[PDB]
Symmetry: C3
Subunit: 488 residues, 3 copies
């Protein structure tokens, strides 16, 4: 008769890392890092994004002639833009607080264009101005959302216009100021010099004076156009007054839907799929708490770490080898993790200890859940733009993001490295504890063999082996025969 205690082994080739040892083969493992994407851009939560194409944000809002598709834009989930868009400000110039506007458009999901100042209301000016830079079919043209006021005959009266925000939400209004090349242009266009442009609301007041100078030619013109924007609150009035050089707005953008969005810089094209997490390289369909695809994610997504391998051990060490756990594992005990092997006269087979296996299984599952179900990630549509005179702010942002990434990478790496040690020691501690429990139950009626096995002095049938496995071993009832056989 003989009973042995050992652990389960199989043909797995999975490896882990530990703070003491490297490349340790295990029976089971769980990868908690995602490294695969579909390489495609598609709909987030069922709502397609806003594809700008070769246009820019300023070109879309101002109404570039070469962006006529984006004049009635439906709802969107995120905005796709190119790094160096071609269709941009048609007339050379600038755009004040451009980055602030782009940041505002990261929490806006829909716009509704209202006509606030109709073109025909300017009955004392000429409103059919154009330029060769912004040309369609050879003929000169201009922005579709702005009006260029010019003299009607040799006189340019004071231009006055107002609008009361009775739409139902905040409104985005853009106006421009013209900077000619020479005094001859100013006289030919506005008939007077020393002009001003004045825009004022209940919070904003602004005066601008045209500045005439010879400039390097961009797009073939030495003139420039400067654009500014404001955010009009509900039930508030905006006032325009100018003696010249005013590029008035004809449409106002009302914020219809708010939420979480962002601008994602790609060179790609929308395709047909759905997703819940989006990266500039592709979508992610995963449930693990880590990934290393791309830092700039849009939507609820797993955390980003700069790691190539994060594997958690959920099984025993694979040391293949009748002996017991001192020699190695068993490749025939496919019922659990810790078990026995009886060798009596009426049979020779393996088994599993249900209680210890269940306890260890619950512990490992709880550990995996605790490591996984402890990280809280919000929407976090990161990504901000800074101008060429804001380099310190850009460096600050970059340093903050990199610092947090390094902190989290170190945290995750060391956590996995320590917990793999803990589980690998937990398993052999459990095996030794089971061996000690069996030895304490058996007392001196058996004979330790040194390889993890026990040799019985009394002939033990299958029922007595079952009693030993359960825990109801009756030492006194086999005591006398054991003594007689041992003393002999």
């Amino acid at each position: 008769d003989q009973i042995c205690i050992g652990y389960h082994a199989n043909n797995s080739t999975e490896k882990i890392d530990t703070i003491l040892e490297r490349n340790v083969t295990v029976t089971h493992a769980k990868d908690i890092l995602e490294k695969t994407h579909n390489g495609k851009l598609c709909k987030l939560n069922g709502i397609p994004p806003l594809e700008l194409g070769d246009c820019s944000i300023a070109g879309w809002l101002l109404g570039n002639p070469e962006c006529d598709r984006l004049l009635r834009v439906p709802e969107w989930s995120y905005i796709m833009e190119k790094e160096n868009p071609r269709y941009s400000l048609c007339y050379p110039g600038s755009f004040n607080d451009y980055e602030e506007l782009k940041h505002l458009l990261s929490s806006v999901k829909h716009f509704e264009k209202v006509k606030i100042l109709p073109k025909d209301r300017w009955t004392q000016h000429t409103t059919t101005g154009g330029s060769m830079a912004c040309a369609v079919s050879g003929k000169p043209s201009f922005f579709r959302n702005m009006v260029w006021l010019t003299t009607k005959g040799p006189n340019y009266p004071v231009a006055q216009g107002s609008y009361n925000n009775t739409s139902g939400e905040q409104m985005l209004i853009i106006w421009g100021v013209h900077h000619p090349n020479d005094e001859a242009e100013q006289r030919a266009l506005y008939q007077k010099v020393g002009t001003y442009v004045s825009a004022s609301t209940s919070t904003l007041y602004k005066r601008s004076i045209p500045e005439i100078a010879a400039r390097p030619k961009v797009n073939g013109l030495g003139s420039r156009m400067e654009f500014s924007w404001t955010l009009l609150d509900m039930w508030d009035t905006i006032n325009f007054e100018s003696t010249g050089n005013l590029v008035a707005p004809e449409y106002g953008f009302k914020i219809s839907k708010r939420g979480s969005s962002g601008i994602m810089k790609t060179e790609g094209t929308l395709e047909n799929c759905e997703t819940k997490c989006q990266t500039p390289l592709g979508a992610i369909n995963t449930t693990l708490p880590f990934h290393n695809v791309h830092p700039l994610t849009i939507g609820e997504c797993p955390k980003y770490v700069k790691s190539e391998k994060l594997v958690l051990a959920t099984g025993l060490r694979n040391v293949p080898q009748i002996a017991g756990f001192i020699e190695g594992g068993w490749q025939g005990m496919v019922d659990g993790w810790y078990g026995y092997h009886h060798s009596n006269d009426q049979g020779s087979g393996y088994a599993a200890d249900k209680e210890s296996t269940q306890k260890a299984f619950d512990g490992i599952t709880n550990k995996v859940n605790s490591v996984i179900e402890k990280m809280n990630t919000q929407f976090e549509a990161v990504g901000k733009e800074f101008s060429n005179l804001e380099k310190r702010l850009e460096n600050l942002n970059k340093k903050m993001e990199d610092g947090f990434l390094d902190v989290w990478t170190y945290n995750a790496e060391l956590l996995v490295l320590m917990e793999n040690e803990r589980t690998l020691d937990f398993h052999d501690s459990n095996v030794k504890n089971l061996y000690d429990k069996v030895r304490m139950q058996l007392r001196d009626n058996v004979k330790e063999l040194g390889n993890g096995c026990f040799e019985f002095y009394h002939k033990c049938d299958n029922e007595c082996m079952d009693s030993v496995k359960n825990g109801t071993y009756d030492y006194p009832k086999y005591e006398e025969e054991s003594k007689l056989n041992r003393n002999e």
Copy 2:
């Protein structure tokens, strides 16, 4: 005769969380999170705060006629300001670099008001101007710390004034520029058009031009007043020159005491209590690392986390059931953690080991003290204000704060879980070591019963048990009759 090794059990209820199991009942536990406050705004370190009431900082520093109780204010610990104050600027307008001023006030604890430009020195202008927007008892009035200069007769000379800072500390000076509504109001107030206001110091030069335009009416007026501020250094001079539209100062604010203060946005009122850690919801009185009351605190305030429960286990696992440490804990052993139970003919009672319990106590205490005392933080204010043209900066600050708090939350949770697991394993290891030491010392004169209890072969008296409990047991002394009784 028997001797057993076991541990202590009681009727405790406190639960802890480990990394392998959840809701483990323990004998002793320590809470390292505080969630209670008195809901009252108190005096920090015995100095009452500054109750602005319905006034803004601009109203206090400019002399709003209805904020007349703040003309002379004593020392303060922090400033309490409502979220939307209602007496800020009776005359509509703007304050330049307002948030910078509010940040500067976070390091100032006392102001002394010094008359720098007396109102009677302007002997060539009119200094009694007023408006209905700032009205007292119905009659028109104006700010109490500023002077409005107006034509005396049908002429307006150049207004010149200077002050040399011979006070003893840095000075704060506020001036303003008036922007009228129409040309008639400019002519009826300053008699000339095309005026300027020039303010200059050794490190500052600034010239402003009045703006005349029709604007929407706020408080019944279409005109605006724009205010600016500067910090005058010691032994430095400030010059004022204006041909119109100047709202000159009369008082300057000198920084008397410097320190660490802050602005708290609350709607409450000050009560009679003393406090070292103040939050917008109440006061904290605790000696613990973490809390979960409010992020924006002021004072020597404990660390902040987003967790609801952080309990450290400083005791044994509570499992009740004469058996030993295998079958569970003991409810009769009251004077220690580990111990022995013995049963002679001359007595049957409990005991407790001293060296082992003392070592365990010292280790647990050192662990708790290390976790508590490594977290070193100081007193600083975390509130910052940003304007509506600075939203990227606001998002940067918000993201940095949130990220740091999530990092510390993760650190605290992992620390507590892993340390609880290690402590609960440490207790079992200590008990097993005690059992092993006793067994090694007793050698073969005894017989293991398998439930942690040892049964002697020879008769053992009280002195023998006292000898086996401390580490001096004479195996040769009882060897011979132990053999005689065993072999029988």
Copy 3:
């Protein structure tokens, strides 16, 4: 004859820290913190730094008459500046976006000075202006890289000048505007009132108007000079136009070499040594992962923490005491860590177990390397400069730096403590495992003595002892002899 199991002890007095114990003596330990520097400023990677002296960045770039040794500056690795430079703008004034220029200079390692507008091209103006503040040898002078334009006779024609960037890289250009003290000197210098200065590129437009006002006298003069800078891209043109008050540039700075550099604020001089990291207090020649000299460094440098000591335990617990291991360590085992001691008829002596010692050594080395070789050492927390109106941004930078530095200090301390505890427990477990291995192999043939020492029941000679040492012990061979001696 007996065989015993014990561990190594020696005369080291090194101490390490543990999460459960303080000041624990260990046989071997490794220090991973560097606290020493050579107290010198010298060459970084073979390139000497730029010694400004009493110069300033603006004084060097403008051509201060006393800042005359840096008119032809070779390659540099970092810039050494003083906290309060004395040779600075000799004509009083300001410098717009100074901190942005200083930030840009942190990524440029070489400049080349190109004559873009020769001083002889101004044939219709006077170009020999000077001031007593900006003085050499008593007689008046001016900056050496700028031209002051003044009327030639009683006439100031329209100044005009352009440059096309055909150099090869980006160019930095600085110009200035003069702000006089009174109308008399404006007329005596520029012959007209109501002047302007226009500078324009393909991406920059600017118009400035002089400000005439009496000002406090700094450096003896009541007038000021305001300077501005731009970054001209390749194949781009800059246009200058002025009717007065223009300080035109004569040279432009080409960015010859780019890289990683910085500005270090010290008060010392350059000496003759060669380093790889540089701190304001000295230089570091180390390979350790950490240091605590100064937060601001330049070069490949270890991480900075607020720690007084960080020592990793790589040895056993020094417990000086043949007994074995229950009583203490051995001072005679000079070979390895764990070993045996035999005492038979032939002789006595110590030995060492090669397998256990090698396994433990490899594990400890792997742990040390994992702690050290997991910290991202790319660069450090650079030093940024902010103005007096950017206090909020400076506070943000300071708080982020402090938060990250605190987080890393806490992480390193807790890592060291927990690793030390686990190392000591690891050594204890290894010794116990060796003891249990020998006991299981030897079984009943021996009797245990209770202090780590086994006594045989037969004659175990040198062949026997070498057999037991390397795990090949024939229990059947001596079974009958052991039974004979045991039973009797």
